[PDB]
C-alpha cells in the first residue's frame, strides 16, 4: 500500500480509499484521513 506520507510522519503510510475508518482486523490504530480516501498508520 501507498508510500503516502501522513501528517507529522515522513516515510509512508497505506493509502486506503473512501473509508471513514480503517479495518479493525488489520492492526492499525493511528491513521490520517483525506476524504474521499485515507492513508493509514502505523507505518
Give how many domains the chain has, as a whole number.
Answer: 1
22-26 CB contacts, 8 Å cutoff, 24+ apart: none
Name the method of structure determination.
Answer: NMR
**Polymer length in residues for the chain:** 43
From the list 13, 10, 8, the residue with the least C-alpha distance to 41 is 13
DSSP of the chain: ------SS--S--EEE-S-SS--TTT----EEEETTEEEE---
Contacts for 20 with CB less than 8 Å, ≥ 6 apart: 33, 35, 38
Structural domain of 37: 1-43
CATH number at residue 34: 2.20.20.10
The residue to which cell 502505523 is assigned: 42
Residues paired with residue 16 on neighbouring β-strands, in sequence order: 38
Amino acid at each position: 500500500a501507498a508510500p503516502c506520507f501522513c501528517s507529522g510522519k515522513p516515510g509512508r503510510g497505506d493509502l486506503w480509499i473512501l473509508r471513514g475508518t480503517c479495518p479493525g482486523g488489520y492492526g492499525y490504530t493511528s491513521n490520517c484521513y483525506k476524504w474521499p480516501n485515507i492513508c493509514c498508520y502505523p507505518h
